[PDB]
Ligand binder design. Sequence first.
Ligand code: X4V
Lengths: 299, 301
Amino acid sequence: GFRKMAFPSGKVEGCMVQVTCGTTTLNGLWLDDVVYCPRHVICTSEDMLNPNYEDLLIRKSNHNFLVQAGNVQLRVIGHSMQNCVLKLKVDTANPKTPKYKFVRIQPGQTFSVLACYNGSPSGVYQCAMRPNFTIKGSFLNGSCGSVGFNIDYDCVSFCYMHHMELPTGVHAGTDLEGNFYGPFVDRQTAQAAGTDTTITVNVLAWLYAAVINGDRWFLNRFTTTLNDFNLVAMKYNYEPLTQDHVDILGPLSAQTGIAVLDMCASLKELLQNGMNGRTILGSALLEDEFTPFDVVRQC
Amino acid sequence: SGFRKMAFPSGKVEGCMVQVTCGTTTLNGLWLDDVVYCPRHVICTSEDMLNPNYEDLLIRKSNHNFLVQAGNVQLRVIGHSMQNCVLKLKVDTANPKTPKYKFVRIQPGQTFSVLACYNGSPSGVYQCAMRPNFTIKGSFLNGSCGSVGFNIDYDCVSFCYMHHMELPTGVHAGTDLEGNFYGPFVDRQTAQAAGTDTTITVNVLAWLYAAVINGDRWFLNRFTTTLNDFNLVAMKYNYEPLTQDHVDILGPLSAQTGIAVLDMCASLKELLQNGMNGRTILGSALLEDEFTPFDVVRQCS
Ligand SMILES: CN(C)c1ccnc(N)c1
């Protein structure tokens, strides 16, 4: 029984609001007395192309921003910009504010996204930050400002805010301090994500999950070196494995008795020869959106 | 584009999850108004699980034998009754977080979200379909009994499933909120096995139509088929047979794309014959069967 799960979204649902600047409406995150959203909400048709946000923001007054939490309107009483995030100070602290922190994640790490439209939560999904710094998300228009998060022991770690849809059906965004993930800019310009790769450490975690779940047909008697594994992996668009990644997998090795470079030889064989009509955890394809931590928690 | 499967936001259900304990057994309960619903096997001892006589066991129990906890607050049980396989515990406090709700029974192929819980605490949420063999491929979380499945429509929560047990095949079985099991299963630890599972063909076709709407058209062919010829081939791949109701349900997607249903069926037949050839459809390397026509149509105008 191994299904991918998102975190329960209730604590985040209590924070979603609707932000409108002129004709543009998108989602905001209401924490204490501040609403956070993408700074491009201030952009206009002319602005779109090569905007100067800061010139545009200081020339915008608080009444330009319409914030709605359900049917109750929040009055913006101050506004400031931090990198690509707009911070709107409101006259009311959110009584539903959970315990939270803003964290920055790394490519390969997983989190849940609460997809919203016009400030209303629509759905939740679990994903990983791709190695090319994009997120395979949904194509729910009007979702800019939807956030990504993890929950650790009652505390919500917000790690991502959605800013734009790339042409290839992938999304790009920032952390909650407005720093972009990846080499992207918040402007309507020709932008494309680099070629994506498979998150090797997560595939290995998933193979560890399969062994713990008694799906062991792919285990072999061989081991490989990290250099030999990396040469093969990069030819198949698998991310290179670092010593840090090997260390992260340490506890799964101790739990299963399969050394990391032993499991690497299994994965190496799987790349070069495939599954030959067999499945792992019931899937014919290798999963790379489960981290080693996700496996230890679930298993 | 990339259609990512999504679960409904679980907040409205999280506010209803409680912990129900009987003797040494703790599991989840659903607190709606002044009633807590949970699997009746919370009342069985280790000696009774092969052949529990629930009526015999329930009559011997009293309100004070049940420990119901909502967070750190103990709710008082003031009544109990059994409805098929669900136990209903009347409590002295109505849940103030009770959302608008309905109990509905679903059919195989229909989708819903599950809020997986442990000890009354929500742990994770996933989206799934009820398989043609009446099981759910759920998570392996321990003591998740009593976790519920639901859909949300315009702020109304429709509860359709409650988890009761894990079958030897790793799959899960449960009931609707009236305590009727989905499929030929019983709340007994006796030898029970799920029949061979099949693919939900109507959902695959809806997903292929979604791909066409998003400009993924590599798999289309110029052939059509009869419904009978399609069903004969599909069953050879353990795909469910398509009925005229399924053809009608796909009608609007056929009209939006200009591809007759039986034309799309011929393309699916080709995919079954050929395999993906390492290609992807809507960003997935596999044929997705847990997206219903209802969900496709709403999301694509
Ligand atoms: C880099 N920028 C714009 C910063 C850094 C730290 N704090 C604030 N508020 C803005």
